[PDB]
Amino acid sequence: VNSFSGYLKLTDNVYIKNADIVEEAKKVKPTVVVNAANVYLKHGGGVAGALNKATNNAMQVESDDYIATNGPLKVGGSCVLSGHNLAKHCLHVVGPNVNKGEDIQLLKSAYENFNQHEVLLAPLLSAGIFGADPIHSLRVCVDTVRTNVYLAVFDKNLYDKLVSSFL
């Protein structure tokens, strides 16, 4: 049993809810929250800007030190950093950004990072301002992640479309 409430069960391991991931993280304090990161860990907008704002910019300060030491992530890659006031850990995952011309085949590689964690609170990778089709992102998630993933979908309209169209 875990603390996640109000989710619709899609599969054995994937759950979905219309929720603000920031407000969900603040309520649950999950072991892992996933950030929709870019390779520079520049948390300007979308999910990353919202998560970082909720940490009072402490996520960005930590991230800048990580990049200064290690250099940029790979598209499809990840790193584990602090979850600050939102979670124990933040798994920063880089899905491909369609609005930069990145290979959508890298979305499966991105979701494979989730398999290193038994339970996660996450957004749909490459959705929103990363430009991918969220229906596609949900299909790749279900077909790739084997650990228990609780997806927070920001748009009520999109949430209802993802559920209604789910095979």
Ligand X SMILES: Nc1nc2ccc(Cl)cc2s1
Site of interaction with ligand X (CB under 6 A): 20-22, 46-47, 50, 128, 154
CB of 27 to ligand X, least distance (A): 13
Q: What tokens does 12 get?
A: 């054995």
CB of 43 to ligand X, least distance (A): 11
- Which CB contacts under 8 angstroms, 24+ apart, belong to 160-165? 160/18, 161/135, 162/16, 162/134, 162/135, 162/138, 163/8, 163/16, 165/135
Alpha-helix residue ranges (DSSP H) falling in 15-155: 21-28, 46-54, 58-70, 106-112, 134-144
CB of 137 to ligand X, least distance (A): 11
Q: Which is nearer to ligand X, 114 or 130 (CB)?
A: 130
Q: Which is nearer to ligand X, 49 or 77 (CB)?
A: 49
CB of 155 to ligand X, least distance (A): 8
Q: Which is nearer to ligand X, 20 or 71 (CB)?
A: 20
